[PDB]
């Protein structure tokens, strides 16, 4: 994919449970696999910010529940390295559901997004309030 432009240590593995950053109706997501990156650590597949991941909906509205959908990791607890050298870490781990095409709706994110991510998925960026 396009260079993220920052160094990332994958915070999440398959099976990790994470917050769903949007108003799709899905509260929490389970990461099944990492698709838009490829399985990076492969034996225990790992995903981090900027990766596109396949997920299943653990918690949310019944319509959403158990749906298998694609998503993008917006934030993670484990730190990142900026070119400048500063490391950035977030409060929690979260992802936003995205479509097959690669769009968000792109109601809002709520919350800030990494510039690295916005660059990779412009449409998602096109709906971010702030990008850090």
């Amino acid at each position: 994919a396009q260079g993220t432009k920052f160094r990332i240590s994958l915070g999440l593995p398959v099976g990790a449970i994470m917050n769903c950053a949007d108003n799709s109706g899905a509260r929490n997501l389970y990461i099944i696999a990492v698709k838009g990156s490829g399985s990076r650590l492969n034996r225990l597949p790992a995903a981090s910010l900027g990766d596109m991941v396949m997920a299943t909906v653990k918690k949310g509205k019944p319509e959403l529940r158990k749906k298998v959908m694609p998503a993008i990791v917006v934030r993670q607890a484990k730190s990142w390295r900026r070119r400048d050298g500063v490391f950035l870490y977030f409060e929690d781990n979260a992802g936003v559901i995205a479509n097959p095409k690669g769009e968000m709706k792109g109601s809002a994110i709520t919350g800030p997004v990494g510039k690295e991510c916005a660059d990779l998925w412009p449409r998602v960026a096109s709906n971010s309030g702030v990008v850090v």
């Binding site: 500063v86 950035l88 919350g111 800030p112 309030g129 702030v130 990008v131 850090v132």
Partner: peptide, 9 residues
């Protein structure tokens, strides 16, 4: 130095 991001940017 370090830069803190407010969240409201």
């Amino acid at each position: 130095g370090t830069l803190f991001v407010r969240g409201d940017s």
